[PDB]
Ligand binder design. Structure first.
Ligand SMILES: *C/C=C(C)/C=C/C=C(C)/C=C/C1=C(C)CCCC1(C)C
Ligand SMILES: CCCCCCCCCC
Ligand SMILES: CCCCCCCCCC
Ligand SMILES: CCCCCCCCCC
Ligand SMILES: CCCCCC
Ligand SMILES: CCCCCC
Ligand SMILES: CCCCCC
Ligand SMILES: CCCCCC
Ligand SMILES: [Br-]
Ligand SMILES: [Br-]
Ligand SMILES: [Br-]
Length: 265
């Protein structure tokens, strides 16, 4: 049960573009990691964990993007005018394993800026993480068959989509029922984060389906391109909005370092 990446030889332009996409993603996440670390001091204690979760996400994704980059250059060699598969192996499956950690972190930092606490926070986080883990795990099993069994990729993806929809319903319901509690005008900002999340996370099932409608070397490139757009949107851009909401609410709650931080800009 191979992946479609192992099926093709690659032109130098295709190979280097994919490598440059992954290495670019590493640099963006580690550059954002520094930003999230420095602005941590400008967030009130109640919200500071949300910015720390951005730091964990940046290193988690950055390590897996660097991992994918070197595996790409390990597994292929330029022979007779094209990059051909060598002794080693490349696989998008390590992305799925990493999602088991990064997705709960992304969801947790949203619940924190929604001002959920105590029993409701733990309760809502447990249902969301369980739904997300069911989405990822059924998706992982599905892509094992992206070459061998296209019908199984479809059926496991339908199961995965059911968890995805239920997960989004919980997220959206909590957002619209707790919007009134949010400070500094961030009741307007949080609805924008929900829509950004809808857009960015939907890119992943689209990349999952690439083997069904573009099973060639250019579809390998398009999938990595979609992953890159989705990774930056769902982690970096999303994290900046979460951090903005965290600081804005900190300032409205009387945190002086937050108020000063916004004043200078
Ligand atoms: C930073 C990485 C993120 C936010 C990854 C998100 C992943 C998903 C939303 C996964 C979606 C899937 C389905 C809805 C159906 C097909 C299989 C998956 C696992 C790709
Ligand atoms: C600003 C510190 C970010 C530097 C990123 C390092 C890129 C490593 C590419 C292998
Ligand atoms: C207030 C407790 C949060 C529960 C929201 C809905 C959970 C989904 C059960 C599937
Ligand atoms: C289709 C997944 C979208 C779920 C959003 C529902 C939010 C409305 C709650 C009032
Ligand atoms: C060996 C492929 C990577 C999957 C990790 C469980
Ligand atoms: C997998 C089909 C679910 C769609 C529900 C809106
Ligand atoms: C035009 C690109 C918008 C980026 C905002 C973060
Ligand atoms: C310096 C706080 C602003 C964060 C959002 C870009
Ligand atoms: Br506080
Ligand atoms: Br990730
Ligand atoms: Br409602």
């Amino acid at each position: 049960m191979k992946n479609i990446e192992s099926l093709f030889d690659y032109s130098a332009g295709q190979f280097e573009f994919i490598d440059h996409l992954l290495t670019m993603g590493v640099g963006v996440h580690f550059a954002a990691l520094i930003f999230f670390l420095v602005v941590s001091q400008f967030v009130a204690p109640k919200y500071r964990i949300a910015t720390a979760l951005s730091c964990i996400v940046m290193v988690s994704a950055g390590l897996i993007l660097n991992s994918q980059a070197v595996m790409w250059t390990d597994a292929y060699a330029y022979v007779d005018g094209s990059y051909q598969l060598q002794d080693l192996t490349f696989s998008n499956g390590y992305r799925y394993v990493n999602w088991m950690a990064t997705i709960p972190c992304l969801l947790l930092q949203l619940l924190i800026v929604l001002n959920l606490k105590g029993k409701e926070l733990f309760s809502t986080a447990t249902w969301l993480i369980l739904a997300a883990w069911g989405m990822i795990i059924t998706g992982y099993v599905g892509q094992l068959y992206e070459v061998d069994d296209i019908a199984q990729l479809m059926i496991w993806g339908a199961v995965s989509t059911a968890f995805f929809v239920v997960m989004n319903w919980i997220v959206g319901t909590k957002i619209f029922k707790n919007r009134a509690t949010m400070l500094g005008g961030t009741d307007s900002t949080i609805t924008k984060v929900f829509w950004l999340m809808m857009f960015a996370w939907t890119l992943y099932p689209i990349a999952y389906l690439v083997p069904a409608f573009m099973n060639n070397a250019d579809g390998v490139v398009l999938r990595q391109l979609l992953f890159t757009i989705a990774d930056i949107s769902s982690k970096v851009i999303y994290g900046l909005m979460i951090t903005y909401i965290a600081i804005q609410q900190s300032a409205a709650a009387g945190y002086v370092p937050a108020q000063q931080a916004l004043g200078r800009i």
